[PDB]
Amino acid sequence: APPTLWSRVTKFGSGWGFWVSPTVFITTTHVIPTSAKEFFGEPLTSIAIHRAGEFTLFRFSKKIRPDLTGMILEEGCPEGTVCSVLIKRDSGELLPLAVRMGAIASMRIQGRLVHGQSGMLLTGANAKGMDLGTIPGDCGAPYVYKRANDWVVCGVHAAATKSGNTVVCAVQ
C-alpha cells in the first residue's frame, strides 16, 4: 500500500486513527481517551466531533496535517470488494491484511453489541492470533481499497470474532 496511506495512520488512545485530510481524523469511538479535553494542541470547543456508534470523525478549525492531500471517505464499500486493513505492529512492521467485505451486520462479540460492515480475512484458514489476524490494539486502523487510479477509505477496525476469521469495519 502507498507510503502516503501509511503516513496517515496515527497512534491514538488504545489503538489508531486515520487522517482523511489536513483537518479530518477518523477513529473507533472505544479507543478515544474518555477524559480527554485537548487533541493536537486544540481545545474541545474548537473541534467538530461527529459520532455514529463505533465511528467517530474529528474536524479541526486549523490544518493539523498540511503535508496531506484530502482523499475520498465513503460509507463502507460494495459487497465483495477486497480491502486492506492498514495495521502497524511492533518494530516499524506494516501489516496490510487482505479482507473480502460483506453485508452491514449487527452481532454480539465478547458480549458487546457491534454494528458495521462485516468482512472475512484472506490471510489463512484459522486466523486467530497476531501472525495472520487482528488484536485489540489494531482498533481504529483504516479499511482502504484502490479503484481506477485512486485509493478510498471506507471505515475503521471496530471488532473481530473469537475465531478471528470475521472482522467489523465501523462506517460513516
Which residues participate in catalysis according to the annotation? 30, 54, 139
Least Å distance, CB 170 to a copy of itself, is 22
With cell 495495521, the residue in question is: 87
Our CB check for a copy of itself shows the closer of 23 and 166 to be 166
Cβ(134)–Cβ(164) below 8 Å:
yes
Query: Which CB atom, from 108 or from 150, has the smaller least distance to a copy of itself?
Result: 150
What are the residues binding a copy of itself (CB under 8 A)? Answer: 1, 3, 82, 84, 89, 92-98, 100, 122-126, 130-132, 145-146
- SS3 of residue 69 by DSSP: coil
Q: What's the burial of 111, exposed, middle or buried (CB within 10 Å: 0-12/13-18/19+)?
A: exposed
Distance of closest approach, residue 15 Cβ to a copy of itself, in angstroms: 19
Least distance (Å) between residue 63 CB and a copy of itself = 28
83 beta partners: 99
Cβ-contact 16, 138 below 8 angstroms: yes
| SS3 assignment, position 32 | coil
Please identify, using beta-carbon distances, which residue of 25 and 145 lies nearer to a copy of itself: 145
